[PDB]
Design a protein around this ligand. Structure first.
Ligand SMILES: C[NH+](C)c1cc(NC(=O)CNC(C)(C)C)c(O)c2c1C[C@H]1C[C@H]3[C@H]([NH+](C)C)C(O)=C(C(N)=O)C(=O)[C@@]3(O)C(O)=C1C2=O
Ligand SMILES: [Mg+2]
Ligand SMILES: [Mg+2]
Ligand SMILES: [Mg+2]
Ligand SMILES: [Mg+2]
Ligand SMILES: [Mg+2]
Ligand SMILES: [Mg+2]
Ligand SMILES: [Mg+2]
Lengths: 320, 201, 132, 304
RNA sequence: GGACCUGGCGGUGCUUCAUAUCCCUCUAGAGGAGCCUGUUCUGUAAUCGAUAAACCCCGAUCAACCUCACCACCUCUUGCUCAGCCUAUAUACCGCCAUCUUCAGCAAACCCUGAUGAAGGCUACAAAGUAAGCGCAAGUACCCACGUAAAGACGUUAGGUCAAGGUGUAGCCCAUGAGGUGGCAAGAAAUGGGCUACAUUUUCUACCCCAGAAACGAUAGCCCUUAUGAAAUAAGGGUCGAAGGUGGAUUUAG
């Protein structure tokens, strides 16, 4: 009965059952086609009725528009893969949201690194799902920073994470804007990261997270082996600790009072002065400590002498 | 309660309302007095003990019946005491007392107990322990004992004024089942003397 | 819990008006009645067909003014003047509004056999009393 | 704000229209007349007086929007800006300074009222510390600026006087003096008339008290005021009563005699008799049965 | 496996309370008898749903037919309907509610702490918290500011109803749909809740509380009459003169 009919909001609420589609209609269309002057056609003042061929053509046009609307529901959207499909580690969120103090972050790229579904226990509800995300934001000029965003919604966690990262940025010194100054050995809690400066064209032979972070920073030619616990949140933090605690050539020259020179095998015996002291020059030479007391790494010595027999080390991979 | 807490009690005493407590009088004339109940009256024929005893004899809100029963009751008490006076001799007339209010009061004061028995659970078995009773509790106990003995159902066709008059005269002369049960309470306290250390208050 | 006419709080983004914001216990403490007919007053006989005509008119108006009535209607009934007061939005074309006004006018006139008056009020957007 | 300015302009033009609307083309249309006029124009019928229609000026309609605390250079105006509670902390500073210079020389506001005066949210303990500071200033012997400071922080008391309202003695009928009083208790209404002299004569509903009240409790209830005031066989009461039962009628009648003998007794004795509790209506009335219960407060069986 | 975080538990400690809820206490009842009415079980060819607190005079502010969806028998095919179905799924739902709640918490958006883990954020003589919004509160109704109502968020129990209606999924259309007539609601028994009693403060009569007289108890069974109805359940009168002697453990309410 017309009286026991009920609204579509209630009907779709009951049908979808999400709590535990009439836009393709003009105002005067019916199947009999008694088209009026006030509706459908505008206001000659003549009442009329269309023919059967016009009615069937109009309803065929309406139906084919309906299957067109169904197709424009079911296209396929292209999501760029991050480290794998159905993952989040290389997914590019957009530029960071513009700050309320007239601030724009347009050269800054944000990359997710880790999305975890994290539960806690509450007295009434039970298990309470909270998404914790970790993102890194950087522009390819040295400034980068990571942050954690925790929420009940993934989008809210993303937004919180990227805004807190642009408020917590670092700066990374680079040798010739392609690599680090030296080799950095750093243990952060239980994550040992061993990184080496590499010459141009070496590429980013690093852990996939390190590749994303160093693409956000601007570094291009580094080796990086991580060991111990490969925890994502400790990996990023230890990497940023080391990259912010680099010692540059100018600081080395000022500290030692000596010239800093480079000898490349590509050029030859030509000495290239890279960093000179900005003050006085120290005149007694550097003490040549014969048989120096340094702490070597057995993996490095194994690789140098060639007993590192592995079927995984120098494998042919894709670009960076 | 339909009274706000600022409403206080009304007090009715002519010796107080005829004349330290001067600031008490001032605060009382500045504070709110609630209305007087129906049972209390400014009269001085009345007894608060008698009124409470009527209110305890009341069943179902029949104050007219409770009053009528006490009417007939100490009416009969006065009648029988006058019979004793008329049938007595000189010194017996000198020693007999026929004021039913005084007989009622003295019967209740003879009927009231001085110690009580409270159950206390030490371990897993209940122990009846002696206890000091408050004055309100012992007066209520005496009056309830008299009423229960009147309604013991062993009286058959006897009427309530006759029952209460007979038990009242026995209680005044220090006999009867109410004095017997007070003595039995003291007997059972004597039985369990040494359990009195179980009290913590 | 009472779920009679109380819209629940989602998280803070739900536009809602005075009517369906207020709960049925404020029915004339704060809200008032949407339909004024004297049928439900103590001496009267015809209140049942008054009510079935009320629900008929409300569903008829919701169905023949499609997607333009902002919130619910004001159905007044004085003498034999039935008055339908509407709060309709400003999104269609005014010739269409006048067309449906006359249409509803004389349809309800010949259905309820009384002078029926459509009194319209146009609003730009759905009014928001609070956000729930 | 421009919102406030054009709202004030709209209110002025609207109240001008509204006075012209009703009857009042003269310029002086006061607020109570505005309320009466809008009450007639839109008959409210809503139980909430804030849900009733209103015509006030936008100062009272709109809340107090606090002004901008800094200009177009930063540089906030008050020196105590970065506390975030500039008015409260400036007040604390001023009272403390007034205590300091006073020492070197030698009812209360509520938290909501102080919040209104400061236009700042306040804590209970902050308000308590302010009150203790002002109490210290009052206990210290202070000068007139201090006194007017305490008095602009202090408000009125609105004390009530509680002498029983003495009904007038109307000298009427033939030559006799009387008072006509009323009483109500438990759905029973009793209006009584006491003449000063007559040695004690009661006329409940045209008959005597031993006929309308066969119960000695009811007769005692009638006796009660005369026996309290020691004027037993001196007056006469003719009373008519509607509704109730025997004790409700007796109590209502008693309240009527008490509230007329108040007129026929001295003021000290009527204060004494009010203290005795005869001039106050007993508000104890029958309660309501509830759905799902078996009486007013009595419930059904097993629930635990 | 080691160490934690949060929550729940503890026949877990200290301290402070509850007051008709915790005990001692106060009053009146249940559980013992009869009757009424639900439920279990048995029975019938004979609906369904509720079923610790939060079922058990519950859907029903109510079944002789009707209601009715049950059964028996006999009939209807574009069937009141551009059919319908009281077919299953309350673990798809909306709808309207119970319970904690005789609570005060829930919290968008931020910020900080924890080497940037799960998480956490307390000291007014103040050590990192700020808060829109919901709720309590406040404001309303009744006779007051008191009291009683109403109100009580997020969530808990996949808590109750696809049978109030709507409805997604699966099914039927010779059927599981539609109509007509007639029956279904009986106790070897048990149990929940009410009503009346077992009398003397009682019973009958007048009075509606100053008398007279006794010295008990079915609203059950049977008969007659009446009300309504097509067709008796209810009412009155007659008849009869049950069991019953104030009810253990336990328990309800104020
Ligand atoms: C058997 N359990 C797993 C169960 C299953 C379902 N539903 C299904 O799995 C069926 N799903 C299909 C039919 C295939 C669609 C269920 O739907 C249910 C339940 C539990 C019951 C228990 C009910 C019970 N009462 C009715 C006797 C009970 O005592 C309680 C209780 N806590 O008091 C319940 O939890 C219970 O009422 C209930 O709600 C159940 C289910 O809902
Ligand atoms: Mg894939
Ligand atoms: Mg079920
Ligand atoms: Mg069927
Ligand atoms: Mg409830
Ligand atoms: Mg309630
Ligand atoms: Mg409230
Ligand atoms: Mg369940």
């Amino acid at each position: 009965s017309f009286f026991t009919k009920l609204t579509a909001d209630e009907l779709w609420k009951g049908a979808l059952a999400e709590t535990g589609l009439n836009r393709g209609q003009i105002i005067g269309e019916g199947r009999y086609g008694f088209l009026w002057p006030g509706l459908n056609v505008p206001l000659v003042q003549t009442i009329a009725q269309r023919s059967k061929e016009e009615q069937e053509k109009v309803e065929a046009d309406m139906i084919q528009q309906r299957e067109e609307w169904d197709r424009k529901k079911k296209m396929k959207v292209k999501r760029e893969r991050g480290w794998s499909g159905n993952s989040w580690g290389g997914i590019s969120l957009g530029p960071p949201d513009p700050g309320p103090c007239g601030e724009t972050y347009e050269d800054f790229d944000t990359r997710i690194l880790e999305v975890r579904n994290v539960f806690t226990m509450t007295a009434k509800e039970g298990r309470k799902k909270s998404i914790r995300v970790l993102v890194a934001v950087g522009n390819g000029k040295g400034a980068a920073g990571f942050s954690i965003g925790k929420a009940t919604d993934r989008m809210d966690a993303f937004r919180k994470a990227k805004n807190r990262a642009v408020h917590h940025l670092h700066y990374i010194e680079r040798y010739e804007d392609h690599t680090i100054f030296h080799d950095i050995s750093l243990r952060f809690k239980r994550t040992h990261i061993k990184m080496k400066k590499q010459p141009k064209g070496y590429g980013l032979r690093c852990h996939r997270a390190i590749i994303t972070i160093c693409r956000l920073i601007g570094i291009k030619d580094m080796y990086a082996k991580v060991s111990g616990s490969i925890n994502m949140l400790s990996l990023t933090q230890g990497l940023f600790r080391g990259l912010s605690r680099q010692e540059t050539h100018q600081q080395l020259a000022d500290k030692k009072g000596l010239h800093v020179v480079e000898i490349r095998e590509e050029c030859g015996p030509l000495p290239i002065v890279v960093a000179s002291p900005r003050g006085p020059l120290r005149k007694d030479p550097e003490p040549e400590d014969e048989v120096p007391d340094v702490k070597l790494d057995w993996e490095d010595v194994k690789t140098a002498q060639g007993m590192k027999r592995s079927v995984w080390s120098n494998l042919k991979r894709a670009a960076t | 309660s339909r009274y706000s807490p600022e409403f206080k009690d009304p007090l009715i005493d002519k010796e107080y309302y005829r004349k330290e407590e001067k600031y008490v009088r001032e605060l009382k004339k500045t504070q709110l007095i609630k209305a007087a109940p129906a049972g209390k009256t400014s009269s001085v024929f009345e007894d608060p003990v008698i009124s409470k005893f009527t209110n305890m004899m009341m069943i179902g809100g029949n104050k007219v019946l409770a009053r009528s029963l006490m009417i007939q009751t100490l009416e009969a008490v006065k009648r029988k005491q006058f019979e004793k006076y008329h049938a007595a001799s000189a010194e017996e007339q000198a020693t007999i007392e026929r004021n039913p209010y005084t007989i009622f009061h003295q019967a209740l004061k003879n009927c009231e107990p001085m110690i009580g028995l409270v159950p206390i659970l030490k371990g897993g078995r209940f122990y009846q322990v002696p206890v000091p009773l408050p004055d309100r509790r012992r007066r209520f106990l005496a009056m309830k004992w008299m009423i229960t003995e009147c309604r013991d159902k062993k009286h058959q066709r006897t009427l309530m004024p006759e029952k209460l008059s007979h038990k009242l005269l026995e209680a005044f002369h220090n006999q009867g089942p109410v004095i017997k049960r007070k003595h039995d309470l003291h007997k059972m306290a004597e039985a369990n003397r040494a359990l009195a250390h179980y009290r913590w208050w | 819990k009472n779920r009679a006419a109380r819209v629940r709080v989602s998280k803070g983004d739900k536009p809602v008006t005075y009517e369906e914001a207020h709960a049925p216990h404020y029915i004339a403490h704060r809200k008032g009645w949407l339909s004024l007919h004297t049928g439900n007053l103590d001496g009267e006989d015809h209140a049942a067909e008054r009510t079935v005509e009320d629900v008929f008119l409300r569903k008829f108006m919701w169905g023949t003014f499609p997607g333009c009535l902002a919130d619910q209607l004001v159905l007044k009934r004085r003498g034999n003047q039935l008055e339908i007061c509407a709060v309709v939005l400003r999104q269609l074309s005014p010739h269409k509004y006048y067309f449906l006004v006359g249409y509803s006018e004389t349809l309800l006139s010949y259905f309820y056999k009384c002078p029926v008056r459509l009194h319209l009020q146009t609003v730009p957007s759905k009014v928001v009393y609070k956000y729930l | 704000e421009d919102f406030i300015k054009k709202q004030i302009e709209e209110f002025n033009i609207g109240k001008r229209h509204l006075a012209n609307m009703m009857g009042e083309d003269p310029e002086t249309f006061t607020q109570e007349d505005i309320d009466r006029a809008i009450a007639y124009l839109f008959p409210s019928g809503l139980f909430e007086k804030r849900a009733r229609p209103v015509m006030k000026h936008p100062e009272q309609i709109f809340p107090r929007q606090r002004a901008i605390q800094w200009g177009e250079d930063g540089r906030p105006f008050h020196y105590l800006f970065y506390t975030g509670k500039q008015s409260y902390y400036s007040l604390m500073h001023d009272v403390y300074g007034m205590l300091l210079n006073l020492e070197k020389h030698q009812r209360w506001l509520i938290k909501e009222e102080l919040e209104e005066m400061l236009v700042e949210k306040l804590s209970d303990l902050d308000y308590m510390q302010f009150i203790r500071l002002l109490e210290k200033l009052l206990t210290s012997q202070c000068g007139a600026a201090e006194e007017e400071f305490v008095q602009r922080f202090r408000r009125s008391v609105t004390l009530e006087s509680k002498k029983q309202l003495i009904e007038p003695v109307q000298y009427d009928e033939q030559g006799m003096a009387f008072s006509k009083s009323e009483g109500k208790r438990k759905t029973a209404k009793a209006e009584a008339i006491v003449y000063k002299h007559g040695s004690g004569r009661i006329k409940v509903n045209g008959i005597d008290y031993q006929l309308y009240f066969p119960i000695t409790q009811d007769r005692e209830q009638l006796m009660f005021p005369f026996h309290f005031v020691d004027r037993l066989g001196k007056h006469d009461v003719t009373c008519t009563v509607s509704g109730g039962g025997r004790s409700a009628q007796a109590g209502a009648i008693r309240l009527a005699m008490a509230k007329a003998l108040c007129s026929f007794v001295t003021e000290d004795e009527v204060e004494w008799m009010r203290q005795a509790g005869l001039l106050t209506t007993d508000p104890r009335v029958r309660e309501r049965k509830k759905p799902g219960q078996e009486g007013a407060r009595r419930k059904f069986t097993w629930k635990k």
